[PDB]
């Protein structure tokens, strides 16, 4: 059920198409450098589809990770 707190709630205004806003895009990735589900992002079909693309742009710019090792276990 993932009832933590949709990443959209815990945040406000932001340009879903800004691939450079590291401090905000960073929020949509998991412990790992994986793009979070709509389940957690709280976004919508259209919103998420645009997020996914901007995040991938950030990755190729080195501002965001493609993958990150998991701590603990």
């Amino acid at each position: 059920p993932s009832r933590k707190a949709k990443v959209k709630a815990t945040l406000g205004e932001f340009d879903l198409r800004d691939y450079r806003n590291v401090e905000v895009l960073k929020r949509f990735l998991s412990e790992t450098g994986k793009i979070l589900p709509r389940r957690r992002t709280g976004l919508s079909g259209k919103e998420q589809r645009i997020l996914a693309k901007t995040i991938k742009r950030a990755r190729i710019l080195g501002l965001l990770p493609f993958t990150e090792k998991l701590v603990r276990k």
Binding site: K8, L11, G12, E13, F14, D15, L16, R17, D18, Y19, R20, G33, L43, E47, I50, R57, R59, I60, L61, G62, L63, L64, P65, F66
Partner: protein, 101 residues
């Protein structure tokens, strides 16, 4: 003419002297490709999420331009020829899709 955004990432270990020779070539190149600079953002060097070219950082650039479409790719080619240039990403400008507004 179309509006783009030229992202350029340079070597983070350049002395103010070299750092300006690369920009010189970035400029002396943009012009050769009908690149009208509507603005720039020398964001400086930043901590990369992963190492690029062995280095853990990179000096960033950003130029909002306007130029002849049939030469965007041809331009990109050139920009990448340099060495202290380890990244080049030209993107068609887009109106911001605000969210949670």
């Amino acid at each position: 003419m179309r509006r783009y955004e030229v992202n350029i990432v340079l070597n983070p270990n350049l002395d103010q002297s070299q750092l300006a020779l690369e920009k010189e070539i970035i400029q002396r190149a943009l012009e050769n490709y009908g690149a009208r600079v509507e603005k720039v953002e020398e964001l400086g060097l930043r901590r990369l999420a992963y190492p690029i070219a062995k280095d853990p950082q990179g000096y960033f650039l950003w130029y909002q331009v306007e130029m002849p479409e049939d030469r965007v790719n041809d331009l990109a080619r050139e920009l990448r020829i340099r060495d202290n240039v380890r990244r080049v990403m030209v993107v068609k400008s887009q109106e911001p899709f605000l969210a949670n507004a």
